[PDB]
């Protein structure tokens, strides 16, 4: 449940953009829905 925003912080930060996290949208994202779209606009950006 709130552990997706840490899933989601680990997946894109070590498996997803090879090492990055700088964007705010792994604190704005409280609930699982918004990890998993924040998640996706994050990793769509950086591509």
């Known amino acids: 449940l709130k552990n ?3 899933d ?3 997946e894109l ?3 997803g953009i090879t090492s990055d ?4 949208a792994x604190n704005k994202a409280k609930t699982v ?3 998993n779209a924040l998640k996706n606009e994050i ?3 950086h591509a």
């Open 4 to 6: 997706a925003k840490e």
């Open 8 to 10: 989601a912080i680990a």
């Open 13 to 15: 930060k070590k498996a």
């Open 21 to 24: 996290f700088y964007f705010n």
């Open 33 to 35: 829905e918004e990890v």
């Open 43 to 45: 990793l769509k950006a």
